[PDB]
Amino acid sequence: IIGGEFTTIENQPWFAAIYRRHRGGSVTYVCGGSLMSPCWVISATHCFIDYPKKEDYIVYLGRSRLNSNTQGEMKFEVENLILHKDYSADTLAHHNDIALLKIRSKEGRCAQPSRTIQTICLPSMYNDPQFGTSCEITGFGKENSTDYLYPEQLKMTVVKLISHRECQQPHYYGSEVTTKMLCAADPQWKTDSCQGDSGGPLVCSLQGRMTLTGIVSWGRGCALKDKPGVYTRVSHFLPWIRSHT
Ligand SMILES: CC[C@H]1CNCc2ccc(NC(=O)c3ccc4cc(C(=N)N)ccc4c3)cc21
Numbered sequence: 001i002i003g004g005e006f007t008t009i010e011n012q013p014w015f016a017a018i019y020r021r022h023r024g025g026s027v028t029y030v031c032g033g034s035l036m037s038p039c040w041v042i043s044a045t046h047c048f049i050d051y052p053k054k055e056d057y058i059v060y061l062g063r064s065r066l067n068s069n070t071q072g073e074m075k076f077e078v079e080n081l082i083l084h085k086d087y088s089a090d091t092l093a094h095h096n097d098i099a100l101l102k103i104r105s106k107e108g109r110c111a112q113p114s115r116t117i118q119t120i121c122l123p124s125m126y127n128d129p130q131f132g133t134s135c136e137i138t139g140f141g142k143e144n145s146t147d148y149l150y151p152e153q154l155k156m157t158v159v160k161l162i163s164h165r166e167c168q169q170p171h172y173y174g175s176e177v178t179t180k181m182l183c184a185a186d187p188q189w190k191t192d193s194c195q196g197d198s199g200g201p202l203v204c205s206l207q208g209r210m211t212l213t214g215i216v217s218w219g220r221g222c223a224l225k226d227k228p229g230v231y232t233r234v235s236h237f238l239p240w241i242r243s244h245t
């Protein structure tokens with residue numbers, strides 16, 4: 001997250017920190033995720049397509065810092081990694097960038113809700129928020145494009161949804177952004193999500209209910225002028241989410 005403010009997991013109870021074990025034992029942060037139900041986390045397929053082995057992944061909930069055990073957290077492994085079978089990736093845009101991870105603790109249990117571990121509701125058929133609505137994002141991604149390290153503390157920011165016809169204009173993304181995607185950004189272009197935040201939640205207050213409207217997918221640079229962040233439109237994939245869970 002570029003700009004924005006630091007925060008703690010108690011503010012983002014459904015955020016999931018997804019790590020991966022390397023050869024030798026070293027472990028590095030990969031992508032973010034959102035808790036759908038006690039046993040399920042939804043993220044982005046491009047975060048796993050290169051190393052499709054469910055065994056190498058570690059998932060944390062109620063964890064507020066990159067390298068510190070936060071009072072109340074729960075460590076998990078992945079019982080099942082399901083990737084969207086029709087996924088692909090062009091020069092900038094990503095398609096059907098959605099994934100499901102069925103989690104399980106060493107004792108064989110799913111997540112146990114607490115003050116710092118909660119689920120977020122999915123959207124309903126054809127009912128997305130109008131353009132211009134403010135929504136928030138959270139992640140452990142770069143604070144600046146030039147950094148090579150990720151911020152030690154969790155961060156979040158607020159951006160505004162952008163209409164599809166506006167996101168398809170020449171100086172934006174043209175025909176590269178389809179109807180299955182949503183754009184969002186900062187009007188002054190000072191804050192935005194960035195590499196390291198992929199797979200994370202785009203939550204919107206819709207009709208009085210916090211709703212997982214998007215999943216961080218792609219974008220040209222970070223916080224660049226006329227270059228919004230692009231997110232997977234969850235509402236479109238409801239049938240897929242239902243059938244695979
Ligand atoms: C080596 C990394 C790699 C693995 N193979 C597929 C793949 C594929 C992709 C990404 N994602 C990004 O690197 C990335 C970069 C910039 C971003 C900018 C925004 C934004 N402007 N809000 C949103 C998401 C981003 C993701 C990473 C990787």
